Write an enzyme that holds these catalytic residues in place. Sequence first.
Site, PDB file in Angstrom:
ATOM      1  N   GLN A   1       4.633  21.996  25.787  1.00  0.00           N
ATOM      2  CA  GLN A   1       4.706  23.336  26.382  1.00  0.00           C
ATOM      3  C   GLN A   1       4.275  23.352  27.850  1.00  0.00           C
ATOM      4  O   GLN A   1       5.082  23.647  28.743  1.00  0.00           O
ATOM      5  CB  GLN A   1       3.878  24.345  25.571  1.00  0.00           C
TER       6      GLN A   1
ATOM      7  N   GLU B   1       8.763  21.430  19.431  1.00  0.00           N
ATOM      8  CA  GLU B   1       9.127  22.836  19.320  1.00  0.00           C
ATOM      9  C   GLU B   1      10.168  23.128  20.412  1.00  0.00           C
ATOM     10  O   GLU B   1      10.025  22.624  21.517  1.00  0.00           O
ATOM     11  CB  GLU B   1       7.872  23.690  19.510  1.00  0.00           C
TER      12      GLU B   1
ATOM     13  N   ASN C   1      -0.161  27.677  36.827  1.00  0.00           N
ATOM     14  CA  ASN C   1       0.901  26.741  37.169  1.00  0.00           C
ATOM     15  C   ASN C   1       1.259  26.779  38.650  1.00  0.00           C
ATOM     16  O   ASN C   1       1.707  25.782  39.206  1.00  0.00           O
ATOM     17  CB  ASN C   1       2.141  27.003  36.319  1.00  0.00           C
TER      18      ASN C   1
ATOM     19  N   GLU D   1       1.691   2.850  47.080  1.00  0.00           N
ATOM     20  CA  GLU D   1       0.726   2.747  48.186  1.00  0.00           C
ATOM     21  C   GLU D   1      -0.447   3.701  47.945  1.00  0.00           C
ATOM     22  O   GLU D   1      -1.614   3.368  48.205  1.00  0.00           O
ATOM     23  CB  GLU D   1       1.416   3.017  49.543  1.00  0.00           C
TER      24      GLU D   1
HETATM   25  N1  GTP Z   1      -2.292  25.140  33.113  1.00  0.00           N
HETATM   26  C1  GTP Z   1      -1.532  25.364  32.051  1.00  0.00           C
HETATM   27  N2  GTP Z   1      -2.033  25.110  30.789  1.00  0.00           N
HETATM   28  C2  GTP Z   1      -1.259  25.345  29.692  1.00  0.00           C
HETATM   29  C3  GTP Z   1       0.042  25.837  29.821  1.00  0.00           C
HETATM   30  N3  GTP Z   1       0.558  25.962  28.580  1.00  0.00           N
HETATM   31  C4  GTP Z   1      -0.368  25.569  27.680  1.00  0.00           C
HETATM   32  N4  GTP Z   1      -1.508  25.199  28.350  1.00  0.00           N
HETATM   33  C5  GTP Z   1      -2.754  24.655  27.787  1.00  0.00           C
HETATM   34  O1  GTP Z   1      -2.389  23.445  27.143  1.00  0.00           O
HETATM   35  C6  GTP Z   1      -3.119  23.251  25.952  1.00  0.00           C
HETATM   36  C7  GTP Z   1      -2.179  23.198  24.747  1.00  0.00           C
HETATM   37  O2  GTP Z   1      -1.207  22.182  24.910  1.00  0.00           O
HETATM   38  P1  GTP Z   1       0.386  22.462  24.722  1.00  0.00           P
HETATM   39  O3  GTP Z   1       1.197  21.747  25.783  1.00  0.00           O
HETATM   40  O4  GTP Z   1       0.607  23.956  24.761  1.00  0.00           O
HETATM   41  O5  GTP Z   1       0.750  21.850  23.275  1.00  0.00           O
HETATM   42  P2  GTP Z   1       2.053  20.942  23.055  1.00  0.00           P
HETATM   43  O6  GTP Z   1       1.831  19.460  22.985  1.00  0.00           O
HETATM   44  O7  GTP Z   1       3.015  21.218  24.161  1.00  0.00           O
HETATM   45  O8  GTP Z   1       2.746  21.555  21.727  1.00  0.00           O
HETATM   46  P3  GTP Z   1       2.291  21.416  20.170  1.00  0.00           P
HETATM   47  O9  GTP Z   1       1.922  19.980  19.893  1.00  0.00           O
HETATM   48  O10 GTP Z   1       3.498  21.754  19.322  1.00  0.00           O
HETATM   49  O11 GTP Z   1       1.146  22.377  19.903  1.00  0.00           O
HETATM   50  C8  GTP Z   1      -4.094  24.414  25.892  1.00  0.00           C
HETATM   51  O12 GTP Z   1      -5.298  23.985  26.497  1.00  0.00           O
HETATM   52  C9  GTP Z   1      -3.453  25.493  26.738  1.00  0.00           C
HETATM   53  O13 GTP Z   1      -4.415  26.353  27.302  1.00  0.00           O
HETATM   54  C10 GTP Z   1       0.555  26.091  31.093  1.00  0.00           C
HETATM   55  O14 GTP Z   1       1.699  26.525  31.239  1.00  0.00           O
HETATM   56  N5  GTP Z   1      -0.245  25.854  32.200  1.00  0.00           N
END
Ligand code: GTP
Lengths: 103, 103, 103, 423, 423, 423
Positions: free
Chosen positions: D11, D72, D223, D251
């Site tokens: 995500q 997902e 982001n 580098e």
């Molecule tokens: N900075 C930032 N953090 C994010 C963002 N989306 C999710 N998070 C954080 O990322 C963590 C969750 O990881 P995810 O990437 O959402 O989980 P995933 O591996 O993509 O998906 P699943 O394994 O199916 O749960 C949590 O700490 C969220 O607060 C984003 O768009 N920006």
Amino acid sequence: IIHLTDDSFDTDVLKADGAILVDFWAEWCGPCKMIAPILDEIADEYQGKLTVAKLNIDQNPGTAPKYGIRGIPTLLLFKNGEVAATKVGALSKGQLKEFLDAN
Amino acid sequence: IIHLTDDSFDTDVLKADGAILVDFWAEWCGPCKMIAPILDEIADEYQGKLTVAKLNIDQNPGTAPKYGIRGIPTLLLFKNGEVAATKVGALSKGQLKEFLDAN
Amino acid sequence: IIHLTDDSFDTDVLKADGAILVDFWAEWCGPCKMIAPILDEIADEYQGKLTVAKLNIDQNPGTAPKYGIRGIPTLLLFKNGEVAATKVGALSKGQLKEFLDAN
Amino acid sequence: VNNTIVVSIGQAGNQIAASFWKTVCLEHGIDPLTGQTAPGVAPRGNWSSFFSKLGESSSGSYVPRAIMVDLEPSVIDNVKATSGSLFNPANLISRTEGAGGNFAVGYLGAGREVLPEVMSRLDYEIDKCDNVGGIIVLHAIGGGTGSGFGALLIESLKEKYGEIPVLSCAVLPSPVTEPYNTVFALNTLRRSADACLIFDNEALFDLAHRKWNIESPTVDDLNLLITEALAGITASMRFSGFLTVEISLRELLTNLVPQPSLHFLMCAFAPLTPPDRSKFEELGIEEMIKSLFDNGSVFAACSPMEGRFLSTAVLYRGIMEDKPLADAALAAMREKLPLTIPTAFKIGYVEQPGISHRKSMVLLANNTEIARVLDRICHNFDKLWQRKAFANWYLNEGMSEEQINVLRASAQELVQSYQVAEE
Amino acid sequence: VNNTIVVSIGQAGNQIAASFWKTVCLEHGIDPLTGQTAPGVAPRGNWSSFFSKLGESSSGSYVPRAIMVDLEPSVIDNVKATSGSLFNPANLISRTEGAGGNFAVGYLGAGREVLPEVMSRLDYEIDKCDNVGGIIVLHAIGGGTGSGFGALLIESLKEKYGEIPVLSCAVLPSPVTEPYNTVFALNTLRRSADACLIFDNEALFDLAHRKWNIESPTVDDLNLLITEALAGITASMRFSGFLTVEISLRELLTNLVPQPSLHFLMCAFAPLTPPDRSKFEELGIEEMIKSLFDNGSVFAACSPMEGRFLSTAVLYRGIMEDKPLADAALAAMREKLPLTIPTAFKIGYVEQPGISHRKSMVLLANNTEIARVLDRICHNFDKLWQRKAFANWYLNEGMSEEQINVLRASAQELVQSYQVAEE
Amino acid sequence: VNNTIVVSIGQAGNQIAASFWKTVCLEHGIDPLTGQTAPGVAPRGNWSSFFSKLGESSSGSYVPRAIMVDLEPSVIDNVKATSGSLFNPANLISRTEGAGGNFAVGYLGAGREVLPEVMSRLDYEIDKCDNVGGIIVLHAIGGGTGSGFGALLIESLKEKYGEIPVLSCAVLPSPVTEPYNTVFALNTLRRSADACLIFDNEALFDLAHRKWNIESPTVDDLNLLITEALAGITASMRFSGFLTVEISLRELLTNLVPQPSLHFLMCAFAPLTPPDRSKFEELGIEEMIKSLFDNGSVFAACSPMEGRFLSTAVLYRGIMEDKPLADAALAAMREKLPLTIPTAFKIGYVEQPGISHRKSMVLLANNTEIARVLDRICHNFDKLWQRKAFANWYLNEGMSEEQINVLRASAQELVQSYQVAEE
Ligand SMILES: Nc1nc2c(ncn2[C@@H]2O[C@H](COP(=O)(O)OP(=O)(O)OP(=O)(O)O)[C@@H](O)[C@H]2O)c(=O)[nH]1
Ligand SMILES: Nc1nc2c(ncn2[C@@H]2O[C@H](COP(=O)(O)OP(=O)(O)OP(=O)(O)O)[C@@H](O)[C@H]2O)c(=O)[nH]1
Ligand SMILES: Nc1nc2c(ncn2[C@@H]2O[C@H](COP(=O)(O)OP(=O)(O)OP(=O)(O)O)[C@@H](O)[C@H]2O)c(=O)[nH]1
């Protein structure tokens, strides 16, 4: 500090062994007074290497015209009885040295 | 130095193998004359890598309007029968190179 | 964010253990509003090392005259019941730190 | 000229990836919904570093050297919805289940199933490069895809390609099973990534609330901060010019990493001025440089000044109003920094500004206070593992109890490395 | 303060020498037809580096520390005709025959006869030096005097004086027996010269035709280019000042030569603006530095950017309008250059402008593309030697067939050295 | 932040100390008669480096980390008369007799009696430091207290504290038993001081007469010159800022001392403009830097340019009108200096000007011409010792005849060290 007359120029400057710097100057010349304290420092730091002389053009009007002096102050470097180099006008104690270093 | 007409554009530019730079220009254009000596240097240093062509828009009014030319000089980079990049206006021999290096 | 009255100054500021920075300020003061967001950052980065207090001179006219305040904003650093240092006027978040670092 | 491929997992990874690519398109004058440029014009800069050209100049296109992987499908569906014909559809790979916040699903389960397709897309992207200079892996490590499959893919990458630099940009969770997944991912990031740049969600949250006045910051806000920093770090690789100091990923990591066992980095950005005022309000060089080196500016919940710098790069871009002042300032910083292991202090310059600031800076540092961030994580992991909170989640999924002890110990070996570097 | 003696051999050598000395006189305010200065005035700069003083200041004179040698007398006769009482007549040595474009005549025949006189003049010049810092040998290597006697004299110089730096400035023929003489001379330039700066007539021709619009360029035109570069390289040795970075021939070659087997150099100059406009049209620093590092600016028919730099010196002189800009530019170049063997990047500055440009730069580089120039030569040599074209010319003159194979192999050993340095 | 303690011994030492502390108070905005600041205000700069705070902010005080020792009480009585409640009364230690210009009295006689009290005050000052970075010993070595007890105390300091840097600032007599005391003190300064900065009274006298027009210069005039230089050297330790290059005594001596056997330093100052005109007449950067490196500007009767520099620091403070010019100038100096033993060339910058010049510079150098100053001394010593002039003075006081030969030889071992470093 060596003062000169027209009468003493021959012996003091021309018959002299070693290099000599002559300051043609006057009291009514602003820039001439400017370098009076500067010339004293060189009289120390160039001991044996140089002797520093002064000629006041008012009380000795005879010498400067012989050397084609265009104004004052004029520094003339003599070696034997010959003008090695020429500096016209007041200058830094540093530019004076670079001038002395090269000649 | 390759001169073009409207009649020769197809074969010389569009059917051409390898990259080609076209200078749309005129005699009454100050800036166009400015880069004429510059374009000669590139014709040397990009041998095989590029061919350099010129089209005088007065005696060949048919081609520029087809490419949406806004003025002169206009440099057009062609690869096959396609415009790769565009440079409008007179420029350094160095900015021209950085333009050619990237495309 | 610690708000003060004239009644609470004694306990909150003077009887306080550890260092404390007091911002004498008003709503009608341009420069005072300028540093309101700045003072919040210091309240974080100097946790335990400093406590940050504010006194609005309109609704509490009694305290500033006691400390010889010449205008606003005035930052006062207290340790025990004593003024360690003084900053008058709005400032960078960086100059504020160098001020806090040294005292 | 070096090519870079950006792989984004999960995500967070993909949402950041989408924001990064949109910004990079805008910097290069490439239409971010179609991959096209205006008629007759080429993109600005060294576009081929991050883009490849498809076909003729008429109906053709500039295609991000990008691969996006998820389990997902919601996030990649959203990318398709917001990004026109920018991406290669074959490079957006998803399945059906999420990993349910389970590292083991991503590393051993559903993750292993996606790997041949993802690896095959890597093959294709790699081979269509004149000279590949690095791979950037964008991911969060608190969930199960970014962490698990991120771990799986970096390992896989290094086994198959070996010499290619691989940089991880990893988002850390802010104080659920997040502490578990972070720790498990860290092992791979320690052993297999050539370097790992952390983005601490805790710090990002604070900055967005504090510096920007956002009462309830969203992931979009967070982001923005990451994207600016990524644009800024990659600017040395994406532009050229009379004054532009071109610097490869190779580098950069060479200068930032003094030993393979100390390759975790942190970054700061300036100006952190709210987007609300971005072009109307500017910092001078003084305040900007001052801010860059301030504890309140780092994308990590900790204080670099209370630790020691192993290494440092200041990456400047945009207008330079007063170069003698900036050099005087950086020289002064260089003599002010707490030091260790011999240090490096590298300065990069890129003429091209980003799209939001007339001038901006990114500070990358290898600093020992990263131990604090990592310590915070391990304390949370230990708090759950001491009582085996969601332990069956991971046990029933293929991991053994003793092997997760190994990974808790592995991360401890990394936290002790940075503590030793300090004293 | 270091003294330099300039020895010029053969047509090209002496014609260049005459142009060089006239320019140097003008830079120092020394009358180029009489060696005198206006009444009471000394020359500018550190004149004693290249001049000695004769007698009193009244009827006295400033005398180039120069020796000119030829076999054919036309060129030295011309020097006498155009240069008043500048030179020491005892230092202009000639005979009667030319060497007829035969290296062997210069090295073994008529050349051996001139050597005791030439060496005796070297003795005299050397001894009348406070501190001798180097000898510059100016010559073309396509003919038989510059090549043969040039070879003979450098060898002789090194045997008798050993430690004195000897730099050859050698003109190469442009695509007759020229390829033969070049190759034979190269051996000595490889083994005995401390360094050799090439001036490729092919490049000079092009620049004069191209940059200057001369339909039929003459040797006078080509000598202008060489003279500017020589004035510019020697400026570090001939001036002093608050900002002037004084650099000896010793220090220069030390920085330019990383191993004794890699001591061939090339140079570029900027601005290459036509003399027609010289003071009316100026380049800014940007365009100037840009041009300096451009493939079209080097005095060698090849492209330094397609090879690798072993070492580099940028020698700036004259007005400095914007030092932060120039430093930013040079730093950027320094990070852009293709590199090998560890590199050096030296920057010199001289306050005093030359006589034709308000500001100018010389780039000296040890670069591997010199192999291309040298390759061009060897291909021509092999084209004639494969069929023994004018072979009897050299055979009947004392060289043996197998020993010229040795010299063709010797030059090949030098061309392979630079090819190895590249990969 | 580093703390420094300044110990001053004897007449010269204490008179200089008083002038130094008054100047430092004025720089920091501390009342030089009471140790107080205006109501509510803290001192400028990093005041705690040289001052400690006593009590509350109301009735409290800022107290020089200073100890003043003498045998004769006149000078310390004068300090009490002119300095209000600035000093800690417990740190001003005196007795009753002078040492009558006898080194042996200070080292073995009355000096041994004062030592436990002086050492006990050192204890107290040391322990009340957060982090002690050095001890500066201010003294003349031509008399018997500064020389004898100065020698005794430095030895004592090094035995008890070991690792603490100790810098001697030592005044040398100008061409009585002064040559004897100087030589005896030099041994300890050679073996036990981490470094020794000389102040040659002969040079100071000349500068005051020459540059300032003082027909009959007094010690007050000479102390002005010393004080400026001391303020300037200590400015790196007493201030902070955006451009301020903070440098510890440790870092400074590390860069100035390449081997423990070569730790004698000299210094120059600019501008040496007469106080009469101080703020009305300014030098530009050019003249200033030029002057700094001039033989007529060093606080030593000798010519650094005729010798060789082992090491160098230029310590600038105040306004910087033109940083590209100053960098160009220093770079040029760096390439002009006669060099040895590998050199260092360090540049410091402090934003805060002193109280008398808008901008000023101190040059510290480890240069081999210090041998000349030292030679002058030894020739005078030998002139008296050859005929045993006041020999019974020292013999009847505990020294043995053979042991003073050892000290004459010890100083000779130091003069030969610097002569060897030159060739
Ligand atoms: N900075 C930032 N953090 C994010 C963002 N989306 C999710 N998070 C954080 O990322 C963590 C969750 O990881 P995810 O990437 O959402 O989980 P995933 O591996 O993509 O998906 P699943 O394994 O199916 O749960 C949590 O700490 C969220 O607060 C984003 O768009 N920006
Ligand atoms: N750049 C330049 N090249 C020259 C000049 N004069 C001759 N040449 C070139 O130098 C080569 C011939 O060498 P020369 O110096 O003329 O022959 P030489 O040794 O002096 O005399 P001989 O042995 O008697 O023939 C040819 O390549 C010419 O093109 C000159 O003035 N300038
Ligand atoms: N520059 C400078 N030199 C001084 C000063 N006072 C004394 N001197 C010189 O210091 C030398 C004498 O040393 P002192 O410090 O006066 O003697 P002492 O050790 O303090 O005292 P006694 O042992 O009792 O004689 C002589 O060379 C004096 O010219 C001063 O204030 N400034």
